[PDB]
């Protein structure tokens, strides 16, 4: 059934599963026309498909061309996401295909279910968790590759970098969502935190700086503090 804080630790058993996040599929700017009416301009977006156990990300870039000549785009976005998730599932060897796909957003269920008819034994699940994967475009290398694309494209990343070498999935995922939750609530601040010290660099094949074990603790503490500060501000507590 639905995914929540009860059944949180199923994410890290050895059943292959993927999260799918569609929030960044159809992205627009909103601007005024010469006649003073409102009009939107689309930009490149991405499907956020992530194996929480392993960190494998299947960043499916959605090129603005996809939308050319299309109506009801926000609705089409869900159908495309589902179309593209299915094709990713078909492109993978059977023993790599997931047993579950969890969508971050309930509106994705029917489109995905429909597109997965050919995979009846793959369960499509909603979630009640409030995950922060919409903040994926606040990760610089990820927003760059999305923005620079000229054609539909898939880019493969590991969203944990090399962390698993030293920590477990559960912990990897908790760091990942902590960072994104901070990026979501106050991007400027969260990024200041991460990049302040110029002597801690980002490896070319990585997304986050190469913090030592000690430094990761300071960072996580600072991301925590950030997030409580912004909540106080939001609600005057």
């Amino acid at each position: 059934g639905a995914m929540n804080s009860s059944n949180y630790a199923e994410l890290f058993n050895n059943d292959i599963k993927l999260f799918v996040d569609d929030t960044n599929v159809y992205r627009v700017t909103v601007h005024k026309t010469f006649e003073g009416n409102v009009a939107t301009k689309a930009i490149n977006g991405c499907i956020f498909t992530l194996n929480p156990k392993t960190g494998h990300l299947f960043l499916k870039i959605i090129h603005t061309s996809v939308w050319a000549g299309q109506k009801r785009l926000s609705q089409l976005a869900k159908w495309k996401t589902a179309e593209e998730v299915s094709a990713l599932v078909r492109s993978l060897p059977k023993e790599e295909q997931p047993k579950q796909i969890i969508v971050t957003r309930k509106a994705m269920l029917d489109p995905l279910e429909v597109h997965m008819l050919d995979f009846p034994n793959i369960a499509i699940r909603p979630t009640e968790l409030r995950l922060p994967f919409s903040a994926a475009m606040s990760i610089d290398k990820l927003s760059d590759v999305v923005m620079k694309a000229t054609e539909p494209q898939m880019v493969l990343f590991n969203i944990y970098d090399d962390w698993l070498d030293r920590i477990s999935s559960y912990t990897a995922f908790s760091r990942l969502t902590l960072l994104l939750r901070a990026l979501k609530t106050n991007e400027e601040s969260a990024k200041m935190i991460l990049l302040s010290d110029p002597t801690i660099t980002i490896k070319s094949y990585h997304l986050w700086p190469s913090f030592t074990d000690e430094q990761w603790i300071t960072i996580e503490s600072q991301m925590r503090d950030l997030i409580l500060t912004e909540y106080g501000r939001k609600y005057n507590v």
Binding site: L76, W79, A82, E83, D110, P111, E113, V114, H115, L117, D118
Partner: protein, 300 residues
């Protein structure tokens, strides 16, 4: 005009016939229903005074033979049976009339209600849904399940309704995934109309049978089949104009005949709001919309 005699009335029961019904007392001398219009299907049904659960009854058609009702004490229920001895049957019917122990199918000549309720229902199609081919009439009750229900147990007692599933390979042409789930015209017109039902009248008859089974036995899977068949149409962008105007009549009379107190279990809020206000056909059900609002404003 045909007659359905009763051997006896051993137990207290409310008997129904089509949309009419009568209370009959334990060992009241009651010996059948007469003046029953030939030319449509009928259904005689039963609710014992002791077990208000399990309503049950028999669909039939006097043209297909001579039928009567006899209470079986081992099974504890009223059973439909066929007398094959023509003379022997007219003999019993004439005697009981003379003794006047029968009630008259009480049709007001202005009333097209049963015909409207049953216009497209044909016995031969019913016997394909209630497979029991050693009888010419068909038994149904409150608790019988459908085939679709059985997939998601005993198949002799199955309601073999035609299986409709919006999220199945049947309904969804590969490559037209989004198209066909938002606009079910394909499923309705080619797969279901032209493919499985052959014509719109078989569809409508099944639709209408399913509704009556829900109404008379509170058969829950039948209520489900009825809504899915309405839903499929309402969710199709492209429907033959005659089917639309016939559906609007069909539903008017189904909504008009429903007992007022049962609107809550029998009417699926989502499908109705979709049909009347959301779907493609929002504008094509003018009589059904008017009767729903003025009789059941709340459900919407």
């Amino acid at each position: 005009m045909n007659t359905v005699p009763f051997t006896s009335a051993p137990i207290e029961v409310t008997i129904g016939i089509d949309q009419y019904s009568f209370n009959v007392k334990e060992n009241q001398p009651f010996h059948g229903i007469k003046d029953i219009p030939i030319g449509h299907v009928h259904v005689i049904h039963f609710q014992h005074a002791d077990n208000s659960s399990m309503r049950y009854g028999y669909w039939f058609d006097c043209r297909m033979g001579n039928f009567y009702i006899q209470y079986d004490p081992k099974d504890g229920l009223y059973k439909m049976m066929e007398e094959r001895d023509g003379a022997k049957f007219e003999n019993i019917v004439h005697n009981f009339k003379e003794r006047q122990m029968m009630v008259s199918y009480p049709k007001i000549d202005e009333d097209d209600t049963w015909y409207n309720l049953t216009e497209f229902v044909q016995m031969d199609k019913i016997r394909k849904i209630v497979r029991k081919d050693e009888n010419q009439f068909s038994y149904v009750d409150s608790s019988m399940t459908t085939v679709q229900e059985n997939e998601l147990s005993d198949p002799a007692h199955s309601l073999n309704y035609t299986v409709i599933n919006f999220k199945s390979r049947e309904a969804i042409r590969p490559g037209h995934e989004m198209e066909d789930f938002l606009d079910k015209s394909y499923y309705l017109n080619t797969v279901m109309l032209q493919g499985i039902f052959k014509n719109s009248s078989n569809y409508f008859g099944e639709l209408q049978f399913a509704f009556l089974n829900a109404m008379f036995f509170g058969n829950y899977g039948s209520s489900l089949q009825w809504h899915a068949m309405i839903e499929l149409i309402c969710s199709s962008a492209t429907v033959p104009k005659h089917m639309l105007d016939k559906l609007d009549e069909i539903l008017y009379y189904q909504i008009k005949t429903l007992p007022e107190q049962y609107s809550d279990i029998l009417l699926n809020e989502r499908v109705w709001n979709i049909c009347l206000y959301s779907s493609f056909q929002k504008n094509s059900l003018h009589n059904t919309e008017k009767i729903m609002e003025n009789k059941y404003p709340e459900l919407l």
